[PDB]
Write a protein that binds this ligand. Structure first.
Ligand SMILES: [Mg+2]
Ligand SMILES: [Zn+2]
Length: 1316
DNA sequence: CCGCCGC
RNA sequence: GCGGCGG
């Protein structure tokens, strides 16, 4: 029935749906009422609209029905106005003009021009809209007793002086009201009225003007004409004049258009649209330029526009505009077409971009900030409803819509336009909905950045020698609290307590609880495990799971071998501990997370459970053999009187129990041990020391090895029961060094299994330690022995220094030469003394404490040893130039005053370096994670076989000469890989797909030595077909384990980690972290080296303030300008492939991508990256640098369209889907030509397809804005995005591959058949 | 990087 | 957010 949430979708909200999720409508602004905490009704906190205040309430919504529309600030103020782009109004300036309603908008038709044709959609000032839209008859009053220079309705021109002090502003028709005077070529009082029109012809019998007094009223005479001159005032009308001779039309006030009849039948017709004024004072019909029109205001004006905009229409319109016009206008349309598409495409239409119904967030979600703003809206939205039914005066209506539109923006996003402040008290912007979603600590960034855990604890860690990697020492007292609930129950299970509350009080104040509470706890923890965490959590091993074994005190006992995993020593470091609550959590915790199960490092296939100093120390001292004094003749190799004599000479004081006597030193002649045990007992009785050379009969051979060695054999053969397989993997021919053991571990892992190895580790751990204590090794000032030759070599070098001095005091050597030669003097002299001290220990004190420590993988480093016994000699000055004088002393002897001071400089520079390099906070582990945090393993052997050939030989360093890449590096590229195609090499058939093990990579190397293979066909992430993910055959052998990678493993992570941790130690040409940042980030490095874009041969032109390297061949040469200060190493003559270093130093990815191609950029990056870690000791598998780098080119540009336009940057694979189904399923081969794009790691992240993820880093506004328009459906895949859901991650156990697995019992299975 | 201690 | 220490 109910279904797992697999897809999430963001779409626009229909006002109908707003009512849909809605429960009641908040109708009033009453926050809190004192009388009863009980909510005051129908404001915000009412319970019907949201729900019951007592014991699903904070899950319902209410809506406020806005009077006149307002809009979403999110869709209007985002950089690219989603509405401004779509509608085509000024994208950023025009909107604001009418969004609040101050300015006007236009509709169906205007035929008249203010000066230009009618504006289909534009807006004009109210004065001008009123002037011609509704017409504009404009008056011009006149001073009393003043005559005019224009008649009744005489045509007037704009700017003319109607009188001395008055002038007109418009052309059209100038109306005159009254004749205070009239001229008559052959004065009218208030009650007088002119019967005669404009300059009308007159006759004698014709009354002109009349009034009340029939007596003395204007009476015509002999041919008079009319010229009226004294108008009280003149009102000008924006109208045309149409004189008529006979009749007229409908009436004065009606509307007319061009053509419509005015008078005299169909003779005098109108020419413009306008109102009618049938004036008979001039016997003419003026049609004022005033026809109706329509237009609305503010959020309302766009609401209309949006509703009519027929996407389809503009879609087609843009289609034409797009591919036909020059790049200047086509580009604008293109960006405009996507939006249009998005809407139509997804369906959910754009008209909703307007707010008419503001959805109210639930009452329990917000217990204050947002409420103050909600009240504002409510108020104005309400004050407005009232201001509409009471009386609607315009100026107020608008002024109100404004404020309203402002408020609606507040609750959504404050600041975009001014900032709202709670009245006097704090000039602080009230946190609006947007502010609550973005920012460093917002809500989208909340689900990811982290938080504190229940069932946690932390304490100081202490070493627990006896403890096995399996377990961990945890303080009972801590466990008590940690496992409190689990304990309570078990308490009732056992009579200790009657109920839970009782068990609790029982632990509330009581001091011990003795054995019984303890018996219970220790019982509850039985097989459960907890996790442990170390300070900076760098790699997956930063947290391991252990079985807790309760202990006394405060500290937490940790296993020694895991001390390497978590960078953790015992000088006070503290670790945190957690508890897996779910039986599922517990499972994974102890299965795939326990310590003993994660032996190998995800970084390199090398072990991480490597025995450390102490263990090694012990193990070595016990396997070493001794050599003494050869008093004489060592020939028993043949004489029998040599067995007897040399054996009695031994009984004497002449021949030692360990003499250089080829076949056998008397030491072997004397003691011959049958059974293996036989040997050790003799030891235990004092006959033989462990380190003595004796003879011993083993399974099938008479072996000449010491007790110690043999004992070691047993220990291992005991750790793992298969005794034969034991000696098959150990070498008792040399003392056990950190490496001989390293390799033993690794071998054991591959050979006997995981857990069995764990057993051996503990084994070694135990013995190593014991033997360590009894061996009797300690340091004493005399233990640091100074070589007798030191006094020699220093003297030899000293005199030698005088020669160099006398040589300059003569003038032979330059000031510089002097210096360089002296350094050389010491640089060699010091190295001389180095091997000397060691030579003295090797020959005279084989068992020197200081020495033995160093040799054995235990502790100490050759370079250090030298600072004790030999001498630390060259310490550099402040800047960098090393000192001229060396530090002649050793630490054994008193390091002198100055020598110390001088040495100081270096120690300080090193400290500074460790600072800024440490605090970088695994910055790279951060960015790496950002671009690989979505990579996971879900598959079925991806079918696409496009492989990467791993090179077995390295080019030039000394010059052109093919070499065999170092053992290390070759491993790095081939270990745990899967062969793309089969390859017969030295007699063996290495099938296809086979995952080449270490041995198999040794083979290939040994073969390259002979000369049978130069490259290697192998599967890799760099060429995986699975869009989002990588499959089994492509990733490879590496796992925490050694067998092939299990599908469902968070490789993205794992790779990011393995690359980040190391970054902590990477502090002309420039490198280190910066080279790593420069490399992951496609950039133009300091020392750029001009790559050759054309592949031909080379030729130069010497000197001349500039040199020039020219790649020329068929007909053209790509000119390369190499500054007079550049270092070029390709010479006048031979060939140069595309993207080959023409200059010396670093290279620029972009260029190299263009010239050579992608398969080269990738391989460049990978290797150029490794280059730094390699030189820093770090050994990480190429796999990981690959996974990352691949993502750096998962996007490509478009040059030949089919669906979307060609200026886009979209996911590479998403195009392999389009092209595949455009040629395959649906015909019409519209090839989608693209261009591979090398985006930077950071930008790859930035623009990562899923919106959820974007909402996290960049800007939450833009991200959601765009994802809004195109109803985006976030296909839930990737750790980040799915983290927010709070759902099980798509990786790990969440792996779609196994998240669904069923367990049954043959009893219930046949039982389902019983149901059938 | 995480943990604490204090205006 | 400022200062001090620890890994
Ligand atoms: Mg430490
Ligand atoms: Zn693949």
């Amino acid at each position: 029935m109910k279904k797992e949430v697999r897809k999430v979708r963001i779409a626009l909200a229909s006002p109908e749906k707003i009512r849909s999720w809605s429960y009641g409508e908040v109708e009033k602004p009453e926050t809190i009422n004192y009388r009863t905490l009980k909510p005051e009704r129908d404001g915000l906190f009412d319970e019907r609209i949201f729900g019951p205040i007592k014991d699903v309430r904070r899950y319902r919504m209410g809506h406020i029905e806005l009077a006149t529309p307002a809009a979403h600030i999110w869709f209007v103020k985002d950089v690219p106005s989603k509405i401004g782009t779509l509608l085509d109004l000024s994208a950023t300036e025009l909107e604001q003009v009418l969004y609040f309603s101050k300015y006007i908008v236009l509709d169906p038709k205007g035929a008249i021009l203010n000066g230009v044709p009618v504006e289909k959609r534009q807006l004009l000032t109210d004065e001008e809209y009123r002037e011609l839209r509704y017409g504009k008859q404009e008056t011009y009053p006149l001073p009393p007793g003043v005559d005019a220079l224009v008649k009744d309705g005489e045509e007037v021109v704009k700017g003319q002086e109607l009188a001395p002090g008055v002038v007109s502003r418009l052309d059209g028709v100038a109306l005159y009201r009254f004749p205070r005077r009239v001229r008559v070529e052959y004065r009218v009082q208030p009650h007088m009225n002119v019967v005669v029109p404009e300059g009308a012809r007159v006759e004698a019998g014709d009354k002109i003007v009349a009034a009340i007094d029939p007596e003395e009223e204007v009476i015509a005479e002999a041919e008079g004409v009319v010229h009226l001159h004294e108008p009280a005032s003149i009102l000008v009308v924006k109208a045309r004049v149409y004189p008529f001779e006979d009749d007229v039309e409908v009436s004065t006030g009606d509307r007319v258009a061009p053509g419509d009849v005015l008078a005299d039948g169909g003779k005098v017709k109108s020419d413009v649209y306008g109102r009618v004024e049938v004036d008979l004072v001039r016997n003419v019909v003026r049609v004022v330029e005033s026809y109706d029109i329509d237009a609305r205001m503010g959020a309302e004006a766009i609401q209309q526009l949006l509703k009519e905009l027929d996407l389809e229409a503009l879609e087609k319109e843009l289609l034409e505009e797009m591919k036909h016009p020059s790049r200047a206008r086509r580009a604008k349309a293109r960006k405009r077409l996507e939006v249009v598409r998005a809407f139509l495409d997804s369906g959910n239409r754009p008209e909703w971009m307007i707010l008419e119904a503001v959805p109210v967030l639930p009452p329990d979600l917000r217990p204050s900030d947002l409420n103050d703003l909600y009240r504002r809206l409510i108020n104005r939205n309400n004050r407005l409803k009232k201001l509409l039914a009471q009386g609607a005066p315009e100026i107020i209506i608008r002024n109100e819509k404004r404020m309203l539109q402002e408020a609606v923006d507040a609750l959504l996003d404050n600041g975009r336009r001014g900032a709202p402040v709670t009245n006097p008290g704090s000039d602080r912007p009230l946190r609006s909905l947007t502010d609550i979603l973005s920012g460093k600590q917002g809500r989208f960034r909340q689900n990811l950045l982290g938080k504190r855990v229940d069932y946690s604890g932390r304490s100081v860690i202490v070493v627990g020698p006896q403890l096995k990697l399996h377990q961990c020492g945890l303080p009972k007292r801590m466990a008590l609290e940690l496992f409190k609930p689990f304990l309570l129950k078990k308490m009732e299970e056992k009579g200790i307590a009657p109920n839970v509350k009782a068990a609790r009080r029982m632990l509330e104040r009581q001091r011990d609880i003795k054995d019984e509470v303890w018996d219970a706890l220790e019982e509850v923890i039985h097989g459960k495990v907890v996790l442990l965490n170390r300070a900076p959590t760098l790699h997956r091993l930063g947290i391991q799971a252990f079985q807790p074994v309760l202990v006394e005190g405060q500290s937490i006992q940790l296993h020694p071998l895991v001390c390497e995993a978590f960078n953790a020593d015992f000088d006070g470091d503290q670790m945190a501990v957690h508890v897996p609550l779910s039986s599922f959590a517990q499972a994974e915790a102890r299965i795939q997370m326990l310590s003993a199960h994660n032996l190998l490092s995800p970084a390199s296939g090398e072990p991480l459970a490597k025995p450390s100093r102490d263990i090694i120390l012990g193990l070595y001292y016990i396997t070493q053999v001794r050599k003494e004094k050869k008093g004489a003749g060592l020939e028993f190799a043949t004489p029998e009187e040599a067995l007897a004599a040399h054996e009695r000479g031994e009984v004497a004081l002449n021949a030692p129990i360990k003499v250089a006597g080829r076949e056998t030193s008397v030491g072997r002649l004397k003691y011959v041990f049958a059974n293996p045990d036989e040997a050790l007992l003799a030891v235990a009785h004092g006959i033989v020391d462990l380190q003595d050379v004796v003879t011993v009969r083993y399974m099938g051979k008479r072996l000449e090895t010491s007790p110690g060695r043999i004992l070691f054999a047993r220990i291992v053969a005991e750790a793992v029961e298969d005794e034969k397989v034991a000696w098959e993997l150990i070498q008792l021919d040399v003392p056990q060094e950190k490496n001989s053991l390293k390799d033993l571990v690794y071998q054991a892992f591959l050979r006997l299994g995981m857990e069995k190895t764990a057993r051996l580790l503990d084994a070694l751990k135990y013995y190593g330690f014991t033997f360590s204590t009894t061996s009797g090794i300690t340091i004493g000032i005399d233990d640091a022995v100074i070589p007798e030759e030191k006094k020699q070599y220093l003297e030899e070098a000293d005199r030698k220094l005088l020669q160099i001095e006398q040589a300059y005091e003569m003038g032979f050597l330059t000031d510089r030469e002097r210096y360089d030669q002296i350094l050389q003097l010491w640089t060699e002299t010091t190295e001389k003394v180095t091997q000397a001290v060691f030579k003295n220990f090797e020959e005279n004190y084989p068992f020197n404490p200081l020495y033995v420590m160093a040799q054995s993988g235990a502790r100490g480093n050759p370079q250090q040893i030298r600072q004790l016994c030999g001498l630390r000699g060259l310490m550099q000055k402040p800047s960098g130039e090393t000192f001229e004088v060396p530090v002649r002393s050793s630490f054994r002897e008193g390091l002198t005053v100055l020598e110390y001071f001088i040495s100081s400089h270096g120690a300080r520079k090193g400290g500074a370096d460790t600072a800024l390099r440490t605090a970088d906070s695994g910055y790279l582990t951060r960015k790496l994670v950002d671009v690989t945090h979505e990579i996971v393993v879900r598959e079925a052997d991806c079918g696409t076989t496009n492989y990467i050939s791993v090179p077995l030989f390295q080019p030039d360093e000394v010059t052109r000469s093919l070499r065999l890449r170092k053992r290390a590096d070759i491993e790095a590229g081939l270990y745990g890989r899967v062969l793309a195609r089969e390859v017969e090499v030295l007699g063996v058939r290495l099938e296809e797909g086979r995952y080449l093990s270490m041995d198999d990579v040794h083979l290939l190397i040994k073969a390259a030595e002979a000369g049978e293979i130069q490259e290697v066909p192998v599967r890799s992430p760099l060429t995986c077909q699975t869009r989002y993910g990588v499959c089994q055959k492509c990733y490879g052998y590496d796992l925490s384990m050694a067998r092939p990678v299990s599908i469902g493993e968070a490789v993205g992570i794992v790779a990011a980690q393995s690359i980040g941790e190391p970054g902590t130690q990477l502090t002309d040409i420039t490198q280190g972290l910066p080279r790593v940042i420069e490399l992951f980030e496609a950039r133009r490095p300091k020392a750029k080296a001009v790559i050759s874009e054309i592949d031909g041969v080379v030729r130069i032109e010497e000197t001349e303030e500039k040199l020039s390297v020219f790649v020329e061949s068929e007909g053209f040469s790509k000119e390369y300008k190499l500054p007079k200060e550049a270092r070029l190493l390709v010479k006048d003559g031979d060939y140069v492939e595309a993207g080959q270093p023409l200059t010396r130093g670093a290279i620029d990815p972009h260029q190299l991508l263009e010239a050579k191609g992608p398969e080269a950029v990738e391989r460049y990056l990978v290797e150029e990256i490794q280059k730094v870690y390699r030189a820093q000791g770090v050994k990480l598998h190429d796999k990981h640098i690959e996974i990352v780098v691949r993502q750096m080119m998962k996007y490509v540009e478009v040059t030949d369209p089919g669906d979307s336009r060609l200026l886009e940057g979209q996911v590479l694979e998403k195009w392999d889907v389009e092209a595949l189904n455009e040629r395959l399923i649906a015909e019409g081969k519209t090839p989608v030509a693209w261009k591979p794009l090398l985006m930077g790691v950071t930008k790859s992240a930035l623009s990562t397809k899923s919106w959820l993820s974007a909402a996290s880093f960049q800007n939450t506004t833009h991200v959601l804005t765009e994802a809004a328009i195109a109803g985006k459906k976030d296909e839930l895949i990737g750790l980040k995005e799915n983290v927010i859901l709070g759902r099980l991650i798509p990786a790990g156990t969440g792996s779609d591959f196994v998240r669904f697995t069923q367990v049954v019992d043959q009893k219930t299975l046949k039982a389902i058949e019983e149901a059938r």
